[PDB]
Amino acid sequence: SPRALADSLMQLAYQVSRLSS
Amino acid sequence: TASPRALADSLMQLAYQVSRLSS
Amino acid sequence: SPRALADSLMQLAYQVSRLSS
Amino acid sequence: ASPRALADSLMQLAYQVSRLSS
């Protein structure tokens, strides 16, 4: 579902924000 | 390659758009 | 890992492409 | 934006994410 995919993308966005260059 | 912060901000904005799609 | 997150994102991108406007 | 366009953008972002570091 769109909502399930959006939830997953939001979680991944926060994880990506904790990476480094 | 963009920064982690810029990529995360982009992903967040896309996630909000995805949520408005339909099955 | 960046690779694992990127692979997850690619899978999600493909699923998004199969959604409807 | 269309599902196709959003998917293209997400794919582009995934390629970039793969070049980041832990």
Residue identified by tokens 């939001």 is A10
Q: What's CA C20's distance to the chain center, in Å?
A: 16
State the best of C7, C8, C18, C21 to mutate against chain A, taking most chain A CBs within 10 Å: C8
Q: For chain C, what's the residue count?
A: 21
Q: For chain A, what's the residue count?
A: 21
* Resolution value in angstroms: 1.1
- Return the closest-CA partner of residue C20 out of A4, D8, D4, D10: D4
Contacts of D10 in chain A (CB under 8 A): 9
Method used experimentally: X-ray
